[PDB]
Amino acid sequence: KFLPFQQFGRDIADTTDAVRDPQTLEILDITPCSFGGVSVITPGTNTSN
Amino acid sequence: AYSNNSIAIPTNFTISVTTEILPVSMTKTSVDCTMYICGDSTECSNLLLQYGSFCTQLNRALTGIAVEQDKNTQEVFAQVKQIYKTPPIKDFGGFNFSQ
């Protein structure tokens, strides 16, 4: 519930998780995407590629 | 007390049971390096490489923590090599194992 006297929104980490348009008042939350790191599972080079 | 001749010997006994908790594995998170450090940005791939491949010495070890987590729960519980089962009739000479 957004009280109609605030302007911005920031959960934590200075994350400005409230973006609103002057004409219409809507609240929103911002989070980084899923994303993933990688690792290669290789048997012996001399065995197979 | 004591002198040149004395000793104490028990006459009765009492079986006792006591727990001993022990951590074995910990829920392992898989946190990546780029997104966290830098999300989707045009300069994300250029300024990131100025330092080098330090993410190689960052995410390489995190997976090792994860794998070692299950190796801890494999050697602990999977000691016996065959899975047994108690007889259908519970008759152990008076002992109760229902708990």
Ligand SMILES: *[C@@H]1O[C@H](CO)[C@@H](O)[C@H](O)[C@H]1NC(C)=O
């Ligand atoms: C890998 O395979 C090659 C065969 O070309 C062999 O000469 C070498 O000793 C092997 N190395 C290992 C570590 O098995």
Ligand SMILES: *[C@@H]1O[C@H](CO)[C@@H](O)[C@H](O)[C@H]1NC(C)=O
């Ligand atoms: C068990 O211990 C009690 C004292 O707690 C003792 O009086 C009794 O003799 C012991 N049991 C036997 C079989 O002696």
